[PDB]
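Hey,

Quick one before I head out. I ran the complex with 8Q1 overnight. Inputs first:
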Amino acid sequence: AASSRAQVLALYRAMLRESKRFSAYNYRTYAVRRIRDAFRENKNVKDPVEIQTLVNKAKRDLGVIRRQVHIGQLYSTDKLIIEN
Amino acid sequence: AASSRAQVLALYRAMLRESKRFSAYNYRTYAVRRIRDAFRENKNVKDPVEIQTLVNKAKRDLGVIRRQVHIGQLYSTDKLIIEN
Amino acid sequence: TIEERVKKIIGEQLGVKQEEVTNNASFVEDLGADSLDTVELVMALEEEFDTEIPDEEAEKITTVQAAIDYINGHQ
Amino acid sequence: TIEERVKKIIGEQLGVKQEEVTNNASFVEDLGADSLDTVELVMALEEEFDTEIPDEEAEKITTVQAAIDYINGHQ
Amino acid sequence: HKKVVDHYENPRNVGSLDKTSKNVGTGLVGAPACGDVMKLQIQVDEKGKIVDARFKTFGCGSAIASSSLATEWVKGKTVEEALTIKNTDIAKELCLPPVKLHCSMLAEDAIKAALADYKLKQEP
Amino acid sequence: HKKVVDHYENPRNVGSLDKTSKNVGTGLVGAPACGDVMKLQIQVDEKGKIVDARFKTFGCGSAIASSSLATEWVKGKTVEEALTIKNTDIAKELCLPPVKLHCSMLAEDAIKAALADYKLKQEP
Amino acid sequence: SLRPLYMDVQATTPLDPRVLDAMLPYLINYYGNPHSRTHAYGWESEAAMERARQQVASLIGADPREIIFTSGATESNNIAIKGVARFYRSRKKHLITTQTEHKCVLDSCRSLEAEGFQVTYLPVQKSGIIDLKELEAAIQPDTSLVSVMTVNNEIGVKQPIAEIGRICSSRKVYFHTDAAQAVGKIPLDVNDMKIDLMSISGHKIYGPKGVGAIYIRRRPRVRVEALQSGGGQERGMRSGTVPTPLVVGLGAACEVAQQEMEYDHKRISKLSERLIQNIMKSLPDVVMNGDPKHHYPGCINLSFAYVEGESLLMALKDVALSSGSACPSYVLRAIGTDEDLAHSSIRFGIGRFTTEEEVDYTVEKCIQHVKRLREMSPLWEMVQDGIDLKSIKWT
Amino acid sequence: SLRPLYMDVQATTPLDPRVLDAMLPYLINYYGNPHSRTHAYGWESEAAMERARQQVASLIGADPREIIFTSGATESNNIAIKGVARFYRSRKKHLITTQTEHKCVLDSCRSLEAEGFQVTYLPVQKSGIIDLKELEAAIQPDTSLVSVMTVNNEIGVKQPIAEIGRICSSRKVYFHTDAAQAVGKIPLDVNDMKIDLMSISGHKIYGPKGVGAIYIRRRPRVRVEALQSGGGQERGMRSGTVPTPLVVGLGAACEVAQQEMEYDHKRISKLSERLIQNIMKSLPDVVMNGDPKHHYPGCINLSFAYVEGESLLMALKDVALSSGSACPSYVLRAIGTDEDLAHSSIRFGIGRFTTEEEVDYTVEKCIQHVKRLREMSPLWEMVQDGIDLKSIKWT
Ligand SMILES: *P(=O)(O)OCC(C)(C)[C@@H](O)C(=O)NCCC(=O)NCCSC(=O)CCCCCCCCCCC
Ligand SMILES: *P(=O)(O)OCC(C)(C)[C@@H](O)C(=O)NCCC(=O)NCCSC(=O)CCCCCCCCCCC
Ligand SMILES: O=C(O)CN(CCN(CC(=O)O)CC(=O)O)CC(=O)O
Ligand SMILES: O=C(O)CN(CCN(CC(=O)O)CC(=O)O)CC(=O)O
Ligand SMILES: *Cc1c(COP(=O)(O)O)cnc(C)c1O
Ligand SMILES: *Cc1c(COP(=O)(O)O)cnc(C)c1O
C-alpha cells in the first residue's frame, strides 16, 4: 500500500516548486499561498478515505499547475510595476 | 544582408518538421500539406520585398505551429479510426 | 527489402520510375528535382530509416548513391 | 553577510529569534517545525543560495549545522 | 446504446419466408412516409408452435432492433403465447428512450399482424 | 496621451499670487458640481506685459493640462495678446478628444476671467 | 477507443490553430474589459476588439463602423429581422423570407407574425433556389425587409444574393442575408451584392463558439431597433460586455478565411466531386438534393432510396455526419422531395482540414452499409420483385 | 514597459487557471456541437454541457433543469425582466426595481415603460440599501416582478435578498435578483432566499467572458417569454448554439468558487479592512460610499474630497481602477452623495489573486497623490483658508 505521508510531502514539494515557475505574478503568488494554506488546513485530518480524496485532488491540481505554467510561458508578458 | 534562399529552405524544413509533431490528425495533415503547397505556389516570386513579406509571414506561422503543437500535446486525445 | 529501399523512396518523392533511378543519378540534374523536393526527400529518408540527418550531412546527399551510402553507414 | 545567512533563513521560516537559532538545534525538536515547515525551509535555502537540494540530501538537513555544512560544501 | 446497435452489427433472422404457405403468417406494418416499415414473418408447425421467423425493416436503429428482437422472441412460443408479447417488454429489453417508444409499438403491431395473417389461413 | 499627463507628472506654475495686488488678475471659473473648477492668476508689469502666472485646478487630467498650458502661454504676452488665445489652440496642442473640448473652453474662460479682473483694477 | 472522422462541418467547425493562438493571450494575460476606459488592461483589450472589427469588415468589404459583435448568427438574425420590423412598424408591416431558412430566421418570423406582422414565406424551386420574379411580385408597398440566406445549411445551395440586392435596392426595401454558412467560403461584398444586413457566425468558420457579428449598412443608413438593453455597448445596438477573446478569434478566423478561401475552395471542390462521383457510380438510386449548378461544394446532401437515414448514420459508426439536420426536414419538403426519400437523406460535410483519405473511407463505408441496409429493407425487397411502392395501402 | 496592478475585478476578472485548463480540451479536440445528436463529437460535447449545468446548479442550490445558459448577465437580465413582463402582460403590467441597479436592468425597464408597462424605481437609503417596508407598500395587485441585485457593482452593498424573497413569495410576485457580483463570493441558496430568477455572469467569477446563466424556478413554475427565437435550444428559453467551451468554463468557475468562497472571503475581508483603514488613517476627508454593515469587502468605493476622480486615476498611473463606473454616477446620486463628492469617488477592487503587496502599493500611491492633487486644487486651497464652499456663486 502506498504511504500517505510520503505521498503528501512529495506532492507538497512538487506543487510548490511547480507553482513558483508561473510567469504571471498573480497566479504565482496565489498558487504558492493557496498550497501552503490548504496543506496546513488539512493537516489534522484522520479519516484515511478523506486523506486519499485530498491526495487525489492535489495530484489533479498538480497537473493543472504544470499545464498552466507551460501555457503561461508560451504566452507571457511583461512583469508588473511591483516586481521591479 | 541575410540570404533569402538560405532562410526560405531552412524555414521550409523547420516548418514541415514541426508540423509533423501535431498530435491531431486533421491539424497535422493540413499543416504539412499547406506548407508544401504554399512554398511551391510562391516559388516564382521575384519582388524581393514580396519575398521578405512571405518570409516574415512564414516565421510568424512557425511560431504558431510550435505553440499549437505543444498545447495539442498537453491536451491530446485518441487517434482517429483511420490511423489504425 | 534490402537497403535499396532508398531507391523506392526517391522514386515516389520525385515521381520517377524505378528504372530511371540509377545509382549515379543526381536529384536535381537527372531527376528534375528542385530545392523544395530535396528538402522533402531528406525528410522522407529520415522517416523511413528512423534516422536524423543534420544540415551538414543533408547538403552532401545530392545523388542516389550518396543517399544509399549515408543510410548504410548509420545503421 | 557570511554563509551564516543560513541562520537568518531558518529564523524567518520558523518564526524564531536569531538568538535561539543555535548550531546544534534541530528544526523539529528544538524550533517547533513540522514536516510542512521543513519542506519550505529546504526550498528557502534552495532559493537563497541558487542550489538544488535533492530528496536524499534534504532528508539529512534536519539541524542548523547540517544546513550550514551542506551549503558550504556546494559553492 | 449497445443493446440497440447490436441488432444491426450482428444481424439475426434477417430474410423472408414463403408467403404462399398455409403455415407462414406475414405482417407488414408502417409506411415509408412515416420512416418506419416493418415486415415480420413467422413459421408455425402443425402443433401451433412458431418454429422459425424472419424480418426486414426500413427504419431507424431502434425500429431495426425492435423488430429484430420481436423476431427472436416469437421463436419457440405458440401462437397464443406470442399474442402476450407487449411493446413495453421490447422497450425495457432495449432500454428505449421515450422518443423511440413508437418503435416498440410498431414491433408489437408487426407480431399481431403476422399472427392474424396466419390465423386467417387456418380457418378451413 | 503623453502630452496631457505631462502637466501633472511635471507640474509648472502651480500656486497662487496676491489677490490684493492691483497688477494681479484672478479668474475663477467652473463649479464643483460640474467636476471642473479652474483658478488662473496673472501678474502684469507696469508696461502691460504678463510677467508671471499661477493656477490651481480641480478637474480631470485634460482640465489640469488645459489650464496648466494656458498659464504657460499667457506668460510673456501682453494683456491684449492674451485675449487672442483660443480654446482651439489649447485643444490642438494637447490633442484633445471631442469629449474633452469643454476643458479647453473653460481654460479660455479662465484667461479672460483673470484678464477682466486685472482690467477692472486699472480703471482709475 | 479510436475516434470517428469528423464530416459534419456545417454543424460546427474545429478551431483553426491560428485562431486559438490569437485568442490565448487574451485568455491568460490580457483579460481586461474592453469598456474599461481608465487603464491599460482596458486599452489593450479595446485595441484588440477594434482590430478584430476591421478584420471582419475587410472580409466582406464593409466599413468597421458597420460591424456589430454578437453571440452568434442566431442573435444577429434576431437583431436584423426583429430590429428592422420593429423600427419601421409604424409605416411598414410586411416581411419576406424563404421556406428553407434556418430555424432561427423562421421562428423569429413566426414570432413577428404573432406581434401583428404579415410574413410571406417564399417557396423555392426543386433546385432549392428562389424564383427572382416571384420575389419581385411579393414585394408590397409596406414591405419592410427581405431576408434570404446566402448558403443553405442543409443542402448547400447558393441563393442569388447580388440579384436579390438589385431588386431590394431598386424598391427601397432592406435586404438581409444569413451568411453563416458562406462567410470565408465564397466571395462576399456588401456593396457589389447590395446587402443591407448580414449575419455571421464564428464557429462555422473555424473560430470559437459563442461569437458572431451583424453587418448593418450605414450609407444609406439602415435603422434597427435594439433588442438587448444595457450600457449602450456596440453603438447602442448590442449591449453587454464585448467578449474580447471571442471577438479576437472571430477576427482572426475572418482574416485566415480571407487568405485561405481560394485555396480551400479548390481543394474542397475536388474532394466534393470525388465523394459524389464515387458514391453514385457504385450505388443505384442515389439522388443529390439541390442544384449542383448553384451549390457550395462543402455541403453535400444525398438521399439513398429504401434506406432510413438514422440507420445509415448508425451503420456509419466511425463517421460523424447528420441527417435532416438544422446545422422531418422542412428543407427537403420545400424542394419537393418525396416524404419517404426525405427520411433517406444524409448530409456530408467537407472542410478546410478534411483529407482525401477521409473521403475515401467515408465513401467505402457508405457504399458498404447502404447495400447492407437495403438487404434488410422490405421496400428494397418489394422493388426487387417488381412491385410499385406507390400502389400499396400503408398506415 | 512594466504593467499596472489589476485592482478592477468588479469590471471583469482574470481567468482562474483551473477554469482555462478545463476549457482547453473543448477548444482543441472536443469541438463538437452539443446539439449534434448522431455522433460522438456531439455526445461528448453535450455531456460536458450538462456537467457544467449541474456545477452551476450546485453552487446556488438549484436543480440543473432550472439553469439556462446565456451569453452573460446582461442577456439573463433581459430574459428575466422582459420575459416575465411580456408573459403576464395580459393580467399584470407593473414592475418594481431599484434606482441603483445595473444599467442593463434599468434600460430594460425603460424599454418596458415605452411598451406600456408601469415601472417603480425604488429609492435606496443613504446606506445604499432599500427600505423593505417601502417595497411592500409599492407592490400593487398587478405587480408582475420585483428585481433587486444581490451585490452592487459600484459600491458593493448587499441588499436583503432573503427578506425580499419572503415579501414577494407571500404576495405571489416573482422575485428576480441580478447576482452577477455575488455568485461564488457570498452564500446563495434559491430556496432559502426564495429566489424565482437569478442572473449569473461568468467573467465576474474568474470564468470566460461571453457566457452566463439565468436560474428560472420550476416549482412553483415561473413562466418566461423567450426573446431569442431559434431551434429551441435550452428548453426553448434561449435559442442558439450552446457554446460548449464557454459553458464548461462557467461550470468550472462555479465549482472552484463553491470550494474557494469561504477562504476567499476571509482573505479578501482582511485585505479590504487593511486598504480602508490605512487610507483613512492617513488622509482627511475620505468617505466610504455604502454601509459597511451590509457590504461585500471586495468592492470598496471611497470619495476623496477636493480631488476629481479621473485625475486621481490618472495620477495612479500604475494601478488599474475605475471611478463612477458601470462595472456622472447615478448610484452615488441615489445614496444622496453631494454632486461634487460624486466626482471625487474611486472604486477599488480586491479579488482572489490580489496580494497584500498590491494593497500596500495602492494605498501608498493613493495617499501620495491625493495630497499632490489637493495641493493643486483650488477648492482645497479655499477650505484651507476657512472658506465655506457652499457659499460661492459658481457656474
Ligand atoms: P530551390 O529550387 O534551390 O529554391 C527554392 C526557393 C523557393 C528558395 C527558390 O525557388 C526561390 O528563391 N524563390 C524566390 C521566391 C520565394 O522565395 N518564394 C518562397 C517565399 S516563402 C513562403 O512562400 C511562405 C509560405 C508560408 C506557408 C505557411 C502555412 C502555415 C499554415 C499553418 C497552419 C496551422
Ligand atoms: P509532517 O509534520 O511529518 O506531516 C505532514 C502531514 C500533512 C503528512 C501530516 O500532518 C499528516 O499525515 N496529516 C494527515 C492528514 C493529511 O494528510 N492532510 C493533507 C492531505 S493533502 C491536501 O490537503 C491537498 C491540498 C491541495 C491544495 C491545492 C491548491 C491548488 C490550487 C491551484 C491553483 C491554480
Ligand atoms: O511568492 C512567491 O513565491 C512568488 N514570487 C513572488 C514575486 N516576486 C517577484 C518575482 O518573482 O519577479 C517578489 C516580488 O513581488 O517582488 C517569487 C518567486 O518565487 O519567484
Ligand atoms: O501526412 C503527414 O505527414 C502526417 N501524418 C499522417 C497520418 N498518419 C497516421 C499517424 O501519423 O498516426 C498516416 C495515416 O493516416 O495512416 C503522418 C506523420 O507524419 O506522422
Ligand atoms: C449556424 C447557423 C446559424 C446560427 O448561428 P450560431 O452562431 O450558432 O448562433 C444561423 N444560420 C445558419 C445558416 C447557420 O448554419
Ligand atoms: C457585469 C454585470 C452585469 C453584466 O454581465 P455581463 O456578463 O457582462 O453581460 C450585470 N449586472 C451586474 C451587477 C454586473 O456587474
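Residues A 20, 25, 28-29, 32, 79, 82-83; H 357 surround EDT (ligand 3) (CB under 6 Å).

Talk tomorrow,
K.
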